[PDB]
Nucleic acid binder design. Structure first.
Ligand SMILES: [Mg+2]
Ligand SMILES: [Mg+2]
Ligand SMILES: [Mg+2]
Ligand SMILES: [Mg+2]
Ligand SMILES: [Mg+2]
Ligand SMILES: [Mg+2]
Ligand SMILES: [Mg+2]
Ligand SMILES: [Mg+2]
Ligand SMILES: [Mg+2]
Ligand SMILES: [Mg+2]
Ligand SMILES: [Mg+2]
Ligand SMILES: [Mg+2]
Ligand SMILES: [Mg+2]
Ligand SMILES: [Mg+2]
Ligand SMILES: [Mg+2]
Ligand SMILES: [Mg+2]
Ligand SMILES: [Mg+2]
Ligand SMILES: [Mg+2]
Ligand SMILES: [Mg+2]
Ligand SMILES: [Mg+2]
Ligand SMILES: [Mg+2]
Ligand SMILES: [Mg+2]
Ligand SMILES: [Mg+2]
Ligand SMILES: [Mg+2]
Ligand SMILES: [Mg+2]
Ligand SMILES: [Mg+2]
Ligand SMILES: [Mg+2]
Ligand SMILES: [Mg+2]
Ligand SMILES: [Mg+2]
Ligand SMILES: [Mg+2]
Ligand SMILES: [Mg+2]
Ligand SMILES: [Mg+2]
Ligand SMILES: [Mg+2]
Ligand SMILES: [Mg+2]
Ligand SMILES: [Mg+2]
Ligand SMILES: [Mg+2]
Ligand SMILES: [Mg+2]
Lengths: 244, 240, 77, 75, 98, 122
RNA sequence: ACCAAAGCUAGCUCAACAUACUAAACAAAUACAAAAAUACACCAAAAUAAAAUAAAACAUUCACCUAACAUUAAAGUAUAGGAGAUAGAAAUUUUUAUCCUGACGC
RNA sequence: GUUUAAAAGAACCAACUCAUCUAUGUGGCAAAAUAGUGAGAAGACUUGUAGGUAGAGGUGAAAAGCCUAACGAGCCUGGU
RNA sequence: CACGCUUACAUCAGUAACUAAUAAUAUACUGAUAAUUAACAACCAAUAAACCAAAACAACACUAAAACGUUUAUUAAUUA
RNA sequence: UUAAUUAACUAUUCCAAAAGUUAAUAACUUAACAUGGACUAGCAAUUUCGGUU
């Protein structure tokens, strides 16, 4: 026998059925789309066509992303969207020589980054590319709010983004209870990323966390049948009272 | 399975505690050091290597203790000595001529005049004469006597310059430390320990030394009389 | 000096708290609702359990100073 | 509660009476209600085995019906 | 950051399909290491009067080390973004007239 | 080799393997090593008085049976609370906030025999 | 004449459709040494596929090899290859709804 | 048990532990045994229970020994 | 007795054939019915303090430095 | 192994990265980790042993 639905669509079917269907539509549509992350380790070519130097003919070239491995320690820091490059290499850079497995690893650094919206200094394991992206975005909070999930590749970064988005959507007075002017000045410069509360609490959540949150939201105690029967009897009595 | 260490005892006690030997096996269970295992059952007598340790912090001055008994210790090659002062007793490493019913001084005071060095006495290096034989010397003030402890071994004080004392270890190497490091004077007990003669191959098994491997290995370049110069003086002073 | 406790035998320190507990104004999503550990969710922090009714055998030993016969002066018995 | 044990199956775990909460019980804490990433293949294998069993049972029933119709031509 | 390139050519896939990879496509050559290239300089706008660089209200090009460990954490300077530069422009315009 | 299909009971092990046969515990271990049995843990059989009880284990063979009507929650409600609530609503003193007079229980933790926790065996 | 011999069924196999995919039983006990009601915790982990084989040897290479894009052509073409064995696209094209499902299968 | 101021990796010799030599056995009682005869027998001794070290390894008083009756590197499954 | 096997144990009855490497019959096959009754054994307190001083008839010693414990203070459901 | 290609890991050393320090663009240091590229050795990995006689 054969399966009616291919194995590649089984996860999609489970996401469509069950409690996964009751999840918010904006979260679902954010999870479905798989955007190609920015090239970090492989250098892409600009144009889509290229002239072969040997064939002297135009051919369509494409970019294939190089698989990069993210160890579980990367989810606790901000490595800038990079990780471990596991692959092979030719010793002495000769094809006809030996093939050798090689693991290229990034240079991690324990740096302390200060956030303006959350007002806390986090001791995070960041990379030089992370610091460069921060300097390019002209701010830690700017970098967090601008780089998406596919470019962060960090659960901690997604949690930071969710926290600052919730703070911006709630206008939290706990930022600076003694400096309302400073709080307002901080909240104004991040106005371009203001997201409503209905979507600000579902951005840095995984599938398991989202299912757990939906279960905690839908967790209702079973009402006793006494209440339902009393309501039915009251309805019947009101009907018999109005039908006379 | 991973084994736990027997050294789980935070409270210092004078009574001997039972210890679980392990023959070359690390906490994993594989041999790390060959030729170890199957010795005699031994207890552990906890030694207090920080000699200058007052009972209460209210009186941090020097103190005198009395030697009760010089006993044998199966864990080290030296002899241990029970010393009592105040309300507590402690095991220390007995010197060459330390007998029962002696008085030992433990001081941390340095003065312009050198003190007369007895055996059981323990003064900082800055207070001892320039040619004094010492043992149980320290690296940092208050760290504890990691250095000379073996039976009969003793170092010698060479000179004191710029509030820093230079000593010479039994390995004929020079060690520079601060002058406030406490050190015990004299030679360690059991000076005839090197002259002992293992009578038979069974005494090694009693001590807990398994026989060497029977594999014949050809000598490499490492073998031969390597006449190397004396290494430079090991300094422990942190110069800013 | 020389501390008499070995780290591998002492009570190991609690694991570091999850990174979601350092974000101000953010509720952690833990596994406390399912009454069991589940990977991917945060570690819930629980307050010290209060057995509203005391049990003689299964209670913590009261301290020495709580005893009514406790005195400041040390007696040598 | 409807739990998922280490074997990937969905079970109905009944609750027991305990004098201490769930986060303080040693015997209960070393239990696992979740499946590791290596149990998905076994779950799919169970699914395929049950599918094959049902398919061959349906084919057997069809063959029996056809045999009976051919043996009794009362139509 | 290490930059690697495949030794072997990957066949095409034009319908948006994922490229069919092989074991031979895991062989990489290290074509560049960004950590070894001469690093660029960070431009920062002073918010206070420091002794070495100069008076508050100027753009200076300092190395990323000092720009990240001294000027930015201590609030001694800010980035050179347009939104942060308009403020200093209007401050200079208010200062020159008075 | 040993057997795997047979049940693993207490008779098949060493002296230090003493597994119970399914009985419930009746106490704990005291001070001197003995067993202290708690009289609250032992089941108290509540036996009624069968002296003047005119009912036998069997019924008359000529007695007729009845159609199977499994008792339901709606039927029980109609039998115990529908007349009372109907009379109360006809009299006009119906209180939707207080339903304890009709037999409803807000919280089970007050009474002795609760229904959801099932504090009683039988 | 013994030993023996012959049944036609239990059922299987390959497909189509298909609800959409870990069956039924789960009173109590079941990850204490499973099926043992009952005490102050610890819980969790990832780091490339390899080789047998072909190149009549074997070192670079060796389709499939438990990762969806299917079909008709382009096309075994451009290309990639100790330029050897072999590997191998794409741009661009075609694909009319349902029943008619059973068996030159045992 | 005996000899010894001796519990001396001493001596004689039991239980016990090994297995020197011979004869049977060789699809045998036995996939290593029987009988006689031997060596140690207070020690580097035998032995009960429970745990650990796992194969690109472990362990080894090196016999390239032993790691569940075939180990110059176990067995099972898959590649096949 | 411990470890291990689980009824192969006990009574009655039958054995033409099945098990005993053959019979007689039966602890080893078959069927029915019964049985092993706790005093022995298993499960059967923590938290701090005083505690250096071997077991070998242990008087006292040797070296290889040696398992085996009480008392005091606070809490230990209390009921065949 | 004095065979041919050379990995991972462990010990050296060097350069780069990172942290910094001095003076009116230069010089200098690295506690624990630790990334990239080279060097010398251990531990080692893959494969082979032309044919007529
Ligand atoms: Mg020793
Ligand atoms: Mg000694
Ligand atoms: Mg030797
Ligand atoms: Mg030798
Ligand atoms: Mg078996
Ligand atoms: Mg038993
Ligand atoms: Mg038994
Ligand atoms: Mg009793
Ligand atoms: Mg070949
Ligand atoms: Mg061939
Ligand atoms: Mg060959
Ligand atoms: Mg071959
Ligand atoms: Mg292959
Ligand atoms: Mg070429
Ligand atoms: Mg060729
Ligand atoms: Mg195409
Ligand atoms: Mg002898
Ligand atoms: Mg014999
Ligand atoms: Mg004879
Ligand atoms: Mg004999
Ligand atoms: Mg003899
Ligand atoms: Mg002899
Ligand atoms: Mg074991
Ligand atoms: Mg090999
Ligand atoms: Mg080996
Ligand atoms: Mg040899
Ligand atoms: Mg040989
Ligand atoms: Mg074998
Ligand atoms: Mg048996
Ligand atoms: Mg017979
Ligand atoms: Mg019988
Ligand atoms: Mg060579
Ligand atoms: Mg190869
Ligand atoms: Mg070889
Ligand atoms: Mg040849
Ligand atoms: Mg030849
Ligand atoms: Mg010839």
């Amino acid at each position: 026998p054969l399966h009616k639905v291919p194995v590649g669509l089984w996860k999609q079917l489970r996401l469509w059925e069950g409690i996964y269907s009751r999840l918010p539509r904006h979260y679902l549509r954010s999870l479905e789309e798989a955007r190609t992350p920015t090239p970090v380790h492989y250098r892409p070519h600009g144009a889509k066509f290229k002239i072969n130097p040997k064939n002297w003919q135009r051919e369509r070239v494409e970019d294939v992303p190089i698989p990069v491995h993210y160890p579980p320690e990367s989810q606790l820091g901000l490595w800038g969207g990079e990780g471990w490059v596991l692959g092979h290499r030719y010793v002495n850079n000769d094809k006809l020589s030996k093939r050798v497995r090689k693991v290229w690893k990034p240079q991690l650094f324990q740096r302390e980054l200060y956030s303006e919206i959350l007002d806390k200094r986090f001791t995070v394991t960041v990379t030089m590319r992370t610091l460069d992206l921060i300097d390019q975005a002209c701010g830690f909070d700017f970098y967090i709010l601008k780089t998406p999930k596919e470019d962060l590749c960090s659960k901690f970064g997604m949690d930071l983004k969710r926290g600052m988005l919730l703070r911006l959507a709630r206008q939290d007075p706990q930022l600076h209870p003694d400096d309302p002017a400073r709080r307002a000045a901080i909240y104004d410069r991040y106005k371009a990323f203001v997201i409503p509360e209905a979507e600000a609490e579902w951005v840095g959540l995984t599938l398991d966390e989202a299912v757990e949150k939906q279960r905690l939201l839908e967790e209702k105690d079973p009402i006793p049948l006494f209440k339902i029967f009393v309501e039915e009897l009251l309805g019947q009595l009101q009907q018999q009272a109005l039908s006379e | 399975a991973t084994s736990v260490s027997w050294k789980s005892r935070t409270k210092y006690t004078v009574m001997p505690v039972k210890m679980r030997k392990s023959g070359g096996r690390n906490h994993t269970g594989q041999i790390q050091v060959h030729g170890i295992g199957g010795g005699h059952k031994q207890r552990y007598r906890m030694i207090d290597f920080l000699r200058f340790r007052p009972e209460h912090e209210s009186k941090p001055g020097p103190f005198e203790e009395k030697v009760i008994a010089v006993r044998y210790d199966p864990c080290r090659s030296a002899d241990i000595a029970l010393v009592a002062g105040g309300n507590r007793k402690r095991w220390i490493i007995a010197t060459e001529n330390m007998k029962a019913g002696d008085t030992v001084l433990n001081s941390d005071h340095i003065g312009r005049m050198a003190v007369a060095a007895r055996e059981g006495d323990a003064h900082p290096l800055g207070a001892l004469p320039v040619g004094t034989l010492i043992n149980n010397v320290e690296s940092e003030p208050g760290r504890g006597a990691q250095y000379i402890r073996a039976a009969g071994t003793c170092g010698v004080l060479l000179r004191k310059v710029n509030g820093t004392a230079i000593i010479q270890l039994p390995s004929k190497r020079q060690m520079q430390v601060l002058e406030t490091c406490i050190a015990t004077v004299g030679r360690v007990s059991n000076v005839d320990h090197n002259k002992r003669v293992i009578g038979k191959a069974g005494r090694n098994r009693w001590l807990g030394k398994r026989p060497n491997s029977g594999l014949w290995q050809r000598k490499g370049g490492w073998a031969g009389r390597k006449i190397r110069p004396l290494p430079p003086m090991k300094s422990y002073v942190k110069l800013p | 000096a020389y501390e008499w406790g070995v780290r591998s035998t002492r009570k190991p320190e609690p694991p570091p708290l999850d990174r979601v507990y350092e974000i101000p104004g953010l509720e952690p999503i833990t596994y406390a609702g399912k009454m069991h550990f589940m990977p991917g969710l945060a570690r819930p922090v629980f307050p010290p359990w209060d057995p509203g009714w005391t049990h003689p055998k299964f209670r913590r030993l009261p301290p020495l100073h709580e005893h009514p016969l406790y005195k400041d002066q040390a007696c040598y018995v | 509660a409807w739990r998922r044990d280490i074997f990937g199956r969905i079970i109905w775990h009944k609750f027991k009476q305990w004098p201490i909460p769930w986060y303080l019980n040693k015997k209960y804490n070393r239990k696992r209600f979740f499946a590791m990433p290596y149990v998905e293949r076994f779950v799919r294998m169970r699914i395929e085995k049950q599918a094959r069993i049902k398919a061959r049972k349906r084919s057997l029933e069809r063959k029996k019906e056809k045999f009976l119709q051919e043996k009794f031509p009362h139509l | 950051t290490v930059i690697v390139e495949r030794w072997w050519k990957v066949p095409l896939a034009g319908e948006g399909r994922k490229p069919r990879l092989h074991r031979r496509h895991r062989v990489y050559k290290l074509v560049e290491d960004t950590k070894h290239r001469p690093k660029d300089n960070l431009e920062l706008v002073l918010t206070q009067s420091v002794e070495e660089l100069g008076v508050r209200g100027d753009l200076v090009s300092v190395k990323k080390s000092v720009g990240r460990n001294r000027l930015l954490p201590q609030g001694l300077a800010v980035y050179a973004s347009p939104e942060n530069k308009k403020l200093f422009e209007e401050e200079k315009l208010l200062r020159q007239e008075g | 080799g040993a057997d795997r299909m047979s049940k693993w009971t207490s008779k098949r092990g060493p002296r230090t393997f003493c597994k119970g046969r399914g009985a419930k515990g009746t106490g704990f271990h005291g001070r001197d090593g003995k067993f202290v049995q708690i009289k609250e843990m032992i089941p108290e059989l509540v036996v009624p008085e069968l002296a003047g009880f005119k009912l036998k284990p069997y019924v008359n063979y000529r007695a007729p049976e009845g159609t199977d009507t499994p008792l339901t929650a709606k039927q029980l409600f109609l039998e115990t609370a529908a007349p009372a609530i109907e009379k109360d609503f006809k009299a006009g003193t119906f209180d939707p906030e207080h339903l304890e007079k009709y037999g409803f229980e807000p919280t089970q933790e007050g009474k002795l025999f609760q229904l959801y926790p099932k504090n009683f065996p039988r």
